[PDB]
Design a protein around this ligand. Structure first.
Ligand SMILES: Cc1cc2nc3c(=O)[nH]c(=O)nc-3n(C[C@H](O)[C@H](O)[C@H](O)COP(=O)(O)O)c2cc1C
Ligand SMILES: Cc1cc2nc3c(=O)[nH]c(=O)nc-3n(C[C@H](O)[C@H](O)[C@H](O)COP(=O)(O)O)c2cc1C
Lengths: 201, 200
């Protein structure tokens, strides 16, 4: 019904008008987006709202991503926390006894980190990438709900992003999300027929 | 009213006996896959488990065992580890009816070439992220239909293909239990927004 309607108006936006994007709207969209579930409720994410370093950042984008990042009034660099033990502890420290029982606090302070310590490098890397996908989706929908266009960009030079945006190396860049109002009518892109991608077991 | 939809999505762990209509599951999946994906590669497979649940449940760790046993449906979400094959599938199925000359060549030639250059980790991260995008959309789609869900990462990935009889080309990403909920759930904790935002 109404969620279908939201989805039909989300498009990959590549050309933006000059209309200003209100930081109150960006903050709201991000606050809705983080209601997203995450494995362990680890919420291992950091949103870097770029309004000043856009031209610099754009030099890291490949092909036509260069023009998208240069023009977009806002780009949100989505980072994930590669120190999953510190991320669990952060949740315990910030939430505290006002949000958590003693059992829950021990879990985030000690149990969970002990679990994370036994993850392979691929397990960690997949975990962060997956949780970034969950929240990135919620974010673009939240923007769309406010009438704001966006595009998720993976074609950029991840190795320079921390340096350019002055973010601790503990955080790795996952995605750039350009944010702005759209200067062109767009058509829905192709999706496989649903019965093509469903299996019954 | 997206804020409101989000506020009614919860991690649901105990379900009522109300049946889950296969039509609703199909519809939620159809909406979910409106999700964007990198390159529009849409590298997903949704395995709707209605008959093999008890056996699937043995692969799920700790408290997840009971969720997978109890849920009237679990959707096992797989990604396509053969991305060149996925690109060419899109081109085959979509065809001339959906794609221009240039678009067809992009999916049959250019895209598989790009995929060939990715490291093993890059490929793993690509499938994981795309799974997260669509899993989020599925879970909201279900919510919008009054249906509860929980995403489960705590399961034995090495045995899911054998148990569910799914070709090894596809790798299990997540189990998503689906059913109507039997308890008042309160929202779980989220960090204050100004704690997860930097300005640059
Ligand atoms: C990727 C992911 C993996 C999850 N894995 C499990 C799990 O294995 N066992 C479980 O009981 N819940 C699992 N969940 C549920 C989370 O604990 C839950 O979504 C989180 O605590 C946030 O609370 P909320 O969903 O009510 O907002 C998982 C959720 C996500 C998104
Ligand atoms: C994970 C992901 C990565 C993407 N990377 C790029 C990119 O590198 N460059 C670009 O121009 N668009 C990028 N996009 C846009 C995709 O091409 C687009 O989302 C996809 O074709 C689906 O189209 P739609 O969102 O309009 O439905 C990306 C989208 C996703 C979700």
């Amino acid at each position: 019904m109404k969620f279908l309607e939201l989805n039909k108006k989300r498009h990959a936006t590549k050309h933006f008008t000059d209309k200003l994007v209100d930081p109150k709207d960006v903050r709201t969209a991000i606050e809705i987006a983080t209601l997203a579930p995450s494995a362990h409720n680890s919420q291992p994410w950091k949103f870097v709202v770029v309004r000043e370093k856009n031209a610099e950042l754009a030099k890291l984008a490949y092909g036509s991503n260069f023009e998208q990042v240069s023009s977009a009034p806002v780009t949100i660099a989505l980072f994930t926390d590669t120190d999953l033990a510190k991320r669990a502890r952060k949740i315990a420290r910030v939430g505290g006894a006002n949000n958590f029982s003693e059992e829950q606090l021990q879990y985030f302070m000690k149990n969970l980190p002990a679990e994370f310590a036994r993850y392979s490098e691929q397990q960690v890397s997949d975990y962060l990438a997956l949780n970034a996908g969950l929240v990135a989706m919620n974010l673009v929908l939240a923007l769309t709900d406010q009438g704001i266009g966006s595009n998720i960009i993976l074609g950029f030079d991840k190795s320079k992003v921390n340096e350019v945006l002055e973010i601790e190396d503990r955080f790795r860049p996952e995605l750039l999300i350009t944010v702005g109002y759209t200067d062109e009518k767009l058509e829905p892109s192709y999706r496989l027929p649903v019965d093509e991608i469903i299996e019954k077991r």
